């Protein structure tokens, strides 16, 4: 159940008054999904940690082909999920349980608020989408550095 899936790369090639050569670079691959769970209180979470294996693999992938490398290559990894309003933060510790150690945060929030995504060699990544995690929904994302 995707609904959106969007990509963020970020070069810096100056830092401290320093030109950063080659520029260091930050990707971050993020999917909003429905959430079962919504509206609903269940113990059994085996379907969101399932969905949850599939995006990290696919979320994975995404941020390695935007920088183009090979995930040998990467420094750093993490990964973070943001609940929408009617879930449950354990739906988020859920979805974040499968292995791709990597840092990981979970939250709740609204449209458009910012996540914070750790870097684990924490450093981080911001993300936001406008419009995601709606009420019912949660807006999962994974990061990678590389140089």
Known sequence: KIRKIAVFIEE???E???EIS?????AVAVAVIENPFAGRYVEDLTELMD???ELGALLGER???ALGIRPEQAESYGKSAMVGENGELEHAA???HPKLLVPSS???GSPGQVLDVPLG???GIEVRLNDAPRANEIMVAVAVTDS
């Open 22 to 26: 080659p520029p260091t670079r930050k």
């Open 12 to 14: 810096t090639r100056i």
């Open 106 to 108: 979970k939250k709740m």
């Open 63 to 65: 941020c390695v082909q």
């Open 51 to 53: 969905t949850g294996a």
């Open 16 to 18: 401290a008054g320093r």
């Open 121 to 123: 060699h924490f450093d």
């Open 94 to 96: 859920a979805i974040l």
